Write a protein that binds this DNA or RNA. Structure first.
Ligand SMILES: [Zn+2]
Ligand SMILES: [Zn+2]
Lengths: 125, 127
DNA sequence: TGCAGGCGCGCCTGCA
DNA sequence: TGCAGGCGCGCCTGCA
DNA sequence: TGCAGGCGCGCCTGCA
DNA sequence: TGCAGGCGCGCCTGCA
Protein backbone atom coordinates (compact mmCIF):
# COMPACT_ATOMS: atom_id res chain seq x y z
CA UNK A 1 0.00 0.00 0.00
CA UNK A 2 1.43 3.37 -1.20
CA UNK A 3 1.10 6.96 0.10
CA UNK A 4 -1.28 9.46 -1.66
CA UNK A 5 1.90 11.62 -2.38
CA UNK A 6 3.53 8.58 -4.14
CA UNK A 7 0.31 8.14 -6.28
CA UNK A 8 0.45 11.84 -7.26
CA UNK A 9 4.14 11.70 -8.28
CA UNK A 10 3.41 8.54 -10.33
CA UNK A 11 0.68 10.47 -12.20
CA UNK A 12 3.52 12.72 -13.55
CA UNK A 13 5.51 9.63 -14.77
CA UNK A 14 6.21 9.47 -18.52
CA UNK A 15 5.09 6.25 -20.24
CA UNK A 16 7.65 4.62 -22.55
CA UNK A 17 7.28 4.05 -26.33
CA UNK A 18 5.96 0.50 -25.64
CA UNK A 19 3.27 1.70 -23.14
CA UNK A 20 2.13 4.35 -25.71
CA UNK A 21 1.93 1.73 -28.46
CA UNK A 22 -0.24 -0.52 -26.20
CA UNK A 23 -2.76 2.35 -25.77
CA UNK A 24 -3.00 2.62 -29.58
CA UNK A 25 -3.52 -1.21 -29.82
CA UNK A 26 -6.35 -1.13 -27.18
CA UNK A 27 -7.91 1.85 -29.11
CA UNK A 28 -7.58 -0.03 -32.47
CA UNK A 29 -9.31 -3.06 -30.83
CA UNK A 30 -12.28 -1.05 -29.33
CA UNK A 31 -12.95 0.52 -32.83
CA UNK A 32 -13.46 -3.10 -34.18
CA UNK A 33 -15.44 -4.50 -31.20
CA UNK A 34 -17.89 -1.50 -31.01
CA UNK A 35 -19.33 -2.76 -34.39
CA UNK A 36 -20.28 -6.17 -32.82
CA UNK A 37 -23.20 -6.35 -30.34
CA UNK A 38 -22.05 -7.32 -26.82
CA UNK A 39 -18.32 -7.80 -27.75
CA UNK A 40 -17.05 -4.87 -25.63
CA UNK A 41 -19.16 -6.05 -22.67
CA UNK A 42 -17.86 -9.67 -23.02
CA UNK A 43 -14.16 -8.53 -23.12
CA UNK A 44 -14.68 -6.31 -20.07
CA UNK A 45 -16.35 -9.30 -18.26
CA UNK A 46 -13.36 -11.57 -19.09
CA UNK A 47 -10.83 -8.95 -17.76
CA UNK A 48 -12.88 -8.23 -14.54
CA UNK A 49 -13.82 -11.82 -13.45
CA UNK A 50 -10.79 -14.08 -14.19
CA UNK A 51 -12.14 -17.15 -12.37
CA UNK A 52 -15.46 -17.04 -14.29
CA UNK A 53 -15.88 -18.59 -17.81
CA UNK A 54 -16.36 -16.10 -20.74
CA UNK A 55 -17.26 -16.23 -24.48
CA UNK A 56 -14.91 -15.71 -27.49
CA UNK A 57 -14.11 -12.08 -28.41
CA UNK A 58 -12.95 -12.29 -32.02
CA UNK A 59 -11.58 -10.01 -34.78
CA UNK A 60 -11.08 -10.71 -38.56
CA UNK A 61 -7.91 -12.66 -39.49
CA UNK A 62 -5.57 -11.24 -42.20
CA UNK A 63 -4.02 -13.56 -44.94
CA UNK A 64 -0.55 -13.05 -43.32
CA UNK A 65 -2.09 -13.66 -39.84
CA UNK A 66 -0.35 -10.53 -38.49
CA UNK A 67 -2.18 -7.42 -37.24
CA UNK A 68 -0.80 -3.88 -37.73
CA UNK A 69 -1.24 -1.02 -35.29
CA UNK A 70 0.60 2.29 -35.83
CA UNK A 71 3.46 0.98 -38.13
CA UNK A 72 4.01 -2.22 -36.04
CA UNK A 73 2.96 -5.80 -36.84
CA UNK A 74 2.40 -8.79 -34.49
CA UNK A 75 0.09 -11.80 -33.89
CA UNK A 76 -3.25 -10.45 -32.47
CA UNK A 77 -3.61 -12.93 -29.56
CA UNK A 78 0.09 -12.30 -28.55
CA UNK A 79 -0.48 -8.48 -28.64
CA UNK A 80 -3.58 -8.54 -26.33
CA UNK A 81 -2.19 -11.30 -24.04
CA UNK A 82 0.87 -9.02 -23.48
CA UNK A 83 -1.38 -6.00 -22.72
CA UNK A 84 -3.62 -7.69 -20.13
CA UNK A 85 -1.72 -10.70 -18.73
CA UNK A 86 1.97 -11.24 -19.55
CA UNK A 87 4.03 -8.15 -20.57
CA UNK A 88 7.20 -10.39 -20.89
CA UNK A 89 5.54 -12.85 -23.40
CA UNK A 90 8.20 -13.92 -25.95
CA UNK A 91 6.12 -15.37 -28.86
CA UNK A 92 3.04 -17.47 -29.75
CA UNK A 93 5.23 -20.56 -28.83
CA UNK A 94 4.64 -19.54 -25.19
CA UNK A 95 0.77 -19.70 -25.72
CA UNK A 96 -1.73 -22.60 -25.96
CA UNK A 97 -5.51 -22.15 -26.27
CA UNK A 98 -7.92 -23.46 -23.58
CA UNK A 99 -10.43 -26.19 -24.68
CA UNK A 100 -13.40 -23.71 -24.51
CA UNK A 101 -11.91 -21.45 -27.22
CA UNK A 102 -13.82 -22.00 -30.49
CA UNK A 103 -11.59 -19.51 -32.50
CA UNK A 104 -7.89 -19.82 -31.36
CA UNK A 105 -5.15 -18.33 -33.58
CA UNK A 106 -3.72 -21.77 -34.49
CA UNK A 107 -7.10 -23.05 -35.86
CA UNK A 108 -6.60 -20.75 -38.94
CA UNK A 109 -10.30 -19.70 -39.08
CA UNK A 110 -11.82 -16.45 -40.62
CA UNK A 111 -12.05 -14.91 -37.10
CA UNK A 112 -9.33 -14.95 -34.42
CA UNK A 113 -10.22 -14.92 -30.68
CA UNK A 114 -8.30 -12.25 -28.72
CA UNK A 115 -9.87 -12.99 -25.24
CA UNK A 116 -6.63 -13.26 -23.13
CA UNK A 117 -8.39 -15.72 -20.75
CA UNK A 118 -8.91 -18.20 -23.66
CA UNK A 119 -5.08 -18.82 -23.70
CA UNK A 120 -2.67 -20.31 -21.16
CA UNK A 121 1.04 -19.62 -20.83
CA UNK A 122 3.41 -22.51 -21.63
CA UNK A 123 7.20 -23.05 -21.67
CA UNK A 124 8.50 -22.74 -25.34
CA UNK A 125 9.49 -26.27 -26.66
CA UNK B 1 -10.05 11.99 -27.13
CA UNK B 2 -10.08 8.78 -24.95
CA UNK B 3 -13.42 6.92 -24.67
CA UNK B 4 -14.63 5.88 -21.12
CA UNK B 5 -14.50 2.16 -22.19
CA UNK B 6 -10.81 2.56 -23.37
CA UNK B 7 -9.98 4.22 -19.99
CA UNK B 8 -11.54 1.16 -18.27
CA UNK B 9 -9.72 -1.43 -20.42
CA UNK B 10 -6.42 0.42 -19.84
CA UNK B 11 -7.04 0.16 -16.05
CA UNK B 12 -6.73 -3.67 -16.52
CA UNK B 13 -3.38 -3.29 -18.40
CA UNK B 14 -0.36 -4.99 -16.83
CA UNK B 15 2.68 -2.78 -16.32
CA UNK B 16 5.98 -4.24 -17.63
CA UNK B 17 9.00 -5.03 -15.33
CA UNK B 18 10.50 -1.54 -16.06
CA UNK B 19 7.27 0.32 -15.09
CA UNK B 20 7.15 -1.70 -11.81
CA UNK B 21 10.81 -0.89 -11.06
CA UNK B 22 10.08 2.86 -11.57
CA UNK B 23 7.29 2.66 -8.91
CA UNK B 24 9.83 1.18 -6.47
CA UNK B 25 12.32 4.01 -7.32
CA UNK B 26 9.64 6.75 -6.76
CA UNK B 27 8.70 5.00 -3.45
CA UNK B 28 12.41 4.77 -2.40
CA UNK B 29 12.75 8.55 -3.20
CA UNK B 30 9.62 9.67 -1.18
CA UNK B 31 10.96 7.72 1.91
CA UNK B 32 14.15 9.96 1.76
CA UNK B 33 12.42 13.29 0.94
CA UNK B 34 9.72 12.90 3.72
CA UNK B 35 12.63 13.41 6.26
CA UNK B 36 13.41 16.90 4.77
CA UNK B 37 11.03 19.86 5.40
CA UNK B 38 9.40 21.07 2.15
CA UNK B 39 11.31 18.64 -0.20
CA UNK B 40 8.20 16.64 -1.24
CA UNK B 41 6.27 19.88 -1.83
CA UNK B 42 9.13 21.34 -3.96
CA UNK B 43 9.40 18.20 -6.17
CA UNK B 44 5.62 18.12 -6.69
CA UNK B 45 5.79 21.88 -7.63
CA UNK B 46 8.63 21.21 -10.18
CA UNK B 47 6.66 18.31 -11.89
CA UNK B 48 3.30 20.27 -11.91
CA UNK B 49 4.63 23.62 -13.27
CA UNK B 50 7.40 22.78 -15.84
CA UNK B 51 7.74 26.38 -17.11
CA UNK B 52 8.18 27.84 -13.58
CA UNK B 53 11.61 27.96 -11.77
CA UNK B 54 12.00 25.63 -8.70
CA UNK B 55 14.54 24.89 -5.91
CA UNK B 56 16.97 21.91 -5.70
CA UNK B 57 15.53 18.60 -4.42
CA UNK B 58 18.58 16.66 -3.23
CA UNK B 59 19.46 13.19 -1.80
CA UNK B 60 22.74 11.97 -0.12
CA UNK B 61 25.53 10.94 -2.52
CA UNK B 62 27.08 7.45 -2.03
CA UNK B 63 30.93 6.85 -2.26
CA UNK B 64 30.51 5.19 -5.70
CA UNK B 65 27.98 7.85 -6.85
CA UNK B 66 25.44 5.13 -7.82
CA UNK B 67 22.05 4.61 -6.14
CA UNK B 68 20.43 1.15 -5.67
CA UNK B 69 16.67 0.57 -5.96
CA UNK B 70 15.53 -3.07 -5.78
CA UNK B 71 18.75 -4.98 -6.89
CA UNK B 72 19.52 -2.42 -9.64
CA UNK B 73 22.10 0.40 -9.57
CA UNK B 74 22.21 3.66 -11.58
CA UNK B 75 23.06 7.38 -11.33
CA UNK B 76 20.28 9.11 -9.29
CA UNK B 77 19.69 12.10 -11.64
CA UNK B 78 19.52 9.67 -14.66
CA UNK B 79 16.99 7.43 -12.80
CA UNK B 80 14.55 10.28 -11.97
CA UNK B 81 15.03 12.12 -15.33
CA UNK B 82 13.96 8.85 -17.04
CA UNK B 83 10.89 8.53 -14.76
CA UNK B 84 9.53 12.05 -15.27
CA UNK B 85 10.94 13.37 -18.58
CA UNK B 86 12.84 11.05 -20.96
CA UNK B 87 12.12 7.28 -20.73
CA UNK B 88 14.66 6.60 -23.60
CA UNK B 89 17.60 8.37 -21.80
CA UNK B 90 20.80 6.36 -22.44
CA UNK B 91 23.31 7.73 -19.84
CA UNK B 92 24.51 10.81 -17.93
CA UNK B 93 26.39 11.78 -21.17
CA UNK B 94 22.89 12.78 -22.48
CA UNK B 95 22.34 15.28 -19.52
CA UNK B 96 23.78 18.73 -18.67
CA UNK B 97 22.75 20.71 -15.56
CA UNK B 98 21.07 24.10 -15.77
CA UNK B 99 22.94 27.14 -14.38
CA UNK B 100 20.43 27.47 -11.43
CA UNK B 101 21.30 24.02 -10.05
CA UNK B 102 23.40 24.41 -6.92
CA UNK B 103 23.87 20.58 -6.52
CA UNK B 104 24.39 18.94 -9.97
CA UNK B 105 25.63 15.32 -10.10
CA UNK B 106 28.94 16.34 -11.74
CA UNK B 107 29.90 18.86 -8.98
CA UNK B 108 30.62 15.84 -6.64
CA UNK B 109 29.09 17.29 -3.36
CA UNK B 110 27.67 15.43 -0.27
CA UNK B 111 24.13 15.98 -1.81
CA UNK B 112 22.99 15.33 -5.40
CA UNK B 113 20.04 17.25 -6.93
CA UNK B 114 17.43 14.92 -8.51
CA UNK B 115 14.97 17.71 -9.69
CA UNK B 116 14.47 16.61 -13.36
CA UNK B 117 13.88 20.28 -14.40
CA UNK B 118 17.42 21.23 -13.20
CA UNK B 119 18.87 19.18 -16.16
CA UNK B 120 18.61 19.54 -19.94
CA UNK B 121 18.88 16.78 -22.54
CA UNK B 122 21.94 16.93 -24.87
CA UNK B 123 23.23 14.69 -27.72
CA UNK B 124 25.89 12.22 -26.36
CA UNK B 125 29.42 13.17 -27.75
CA UNK B 126 31.15 10.92 -30.33
CA UNK B 127 34.01 8.77 -28.87
C1' DT C 1 -16.49 18.34 -56.11
C1' DG C 2 -11.45 19.69 -55.43
C1' DC C 3 -8.03 18.85 -52.21
C1' DA C 4 -5.86 16.87 -48.48
C1' DG C 5 -4.30 13.57 -44.66
C1' DG C 6 -4.37 9.14 -41.79
C1' DC C 7 -4.55 4.18 -41.41
C1' DG C 8 -3.50 -0.86 -42.41
C1' DC C 9 -3.64 -5.17 -45.40
C1' DG C 10 -1.52 -7.09 -49.07
C1' DC C 11 2.40 -7.57 -51.49
C1' DC C 12 7.30 -8.04 -51.89
C1' DT C 13 11.88 -9.04 -50.26
C1' DG C 14 15.60 -10.96 -47.42
C1' DC C 15 17.90 -13.81 -44.19
C1' DA C 16 18.18 -18.48 -41.73
C1' DT D 1 8.35 -24.00 -44.86
C1' DG D 2 9.12 -19.49 -40.27
C1' DC D 3 9.76 -14.88 -39.23
C1' DA D 4 10.40 -10.25 -39.96
C1' DG D 5 10.45 -5.42 -42.06
C1' DG D 6 9.56 -1.83 -45.82
C1' DC D 7 6.44 0.20 -49.01
C1' DG D 8 2.14 2.13 -51.09
C1' DC D 9 -2.74 1.85 -53.00
C1' DG D 10 -7.17 1.72 -51.56
C1' DC D 11 -10.23 3.01 -48.32
C1' DC D 12 -12.08 6.33 -45.15
C1' DT D 13 -12.88 10.95 -43.40
C1' DG D 14 -13.48 16.01 -43.41
C1' DC D 15 -14.05 20.58 -45.12
C1' DA D 16 -15.56 24.80 -48.28
C1' DT E 1 39.98 4.73 -15.06
C1' DG E 2 34.96 4.32 -16.61
C1' DC E 3 31.42 1.16 -16.09
C1' DA E 4 29.07 -2.63 -14.45
C1' DG E 5 27.29 -6.61 -11.47
C1' DG E 6 27.13 -9.77 -7.24
C1' DC E 7 27.14 -10.50 -2.33
C1' DG E 8 25.96 -9.82 2.74
C1' DC E 9 26.05 -7.14 7.25
C1' DG E 10 23.98 -3.54 9.36
C1' DC E 11 20.12 -1.04 9.89
C1' DC E 12 15.23 -0.51 10.23
C1' DT E 13 10.56 -2.05 10.97
C1' DG E 14 6.70 -4.89 12.58
C1' DC E 15 4.21 -8.23 15.13
C1' DA E 16 3.71 -11.00 19.60
C1' DT F 1 13.44 -8.58 25.63
C1' DG F 2 12.68 -12.82 20.78
C1' DC F 3 12.16 -13.52 16.09
C1' DA F 4 11.69 -12.45 11.51
C1' DG F 5 11.86 -10.03 6.84
C1' DG F 6 12.99 -6.06 3.54
C1' DC F 7 16.27 -2.84 1.84
C1' DG F 8 20.68 -0.77 0.19
C1' DC F 9 25.61 0.96 0.75
C1' DG F 10 29.98 -0.64 0.92
C1' DC F 11 32.99 -3.87 -0.50
C1' DC F 12 34.85 -6.87 -3.98
C1' DT F 13 35.74 -8.33 -8.68
C1' DG F 14 36.50 -7.99 -13.71
C1' DC F 15 37.27 -5.99 -18.13
C1' DA F 16 39.02 -2.59 -22.08
ZN1 LIG G 1 -11.90 -17.86 -27.62
ZN1 LIG H 1 19.22 21.52 -8.60
Amino acid sequence: FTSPAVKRLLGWKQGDEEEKWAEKAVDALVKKLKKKKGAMEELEKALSSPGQPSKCVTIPRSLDGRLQVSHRKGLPHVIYCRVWRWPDLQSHHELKPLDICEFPFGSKQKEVCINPYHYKRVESP
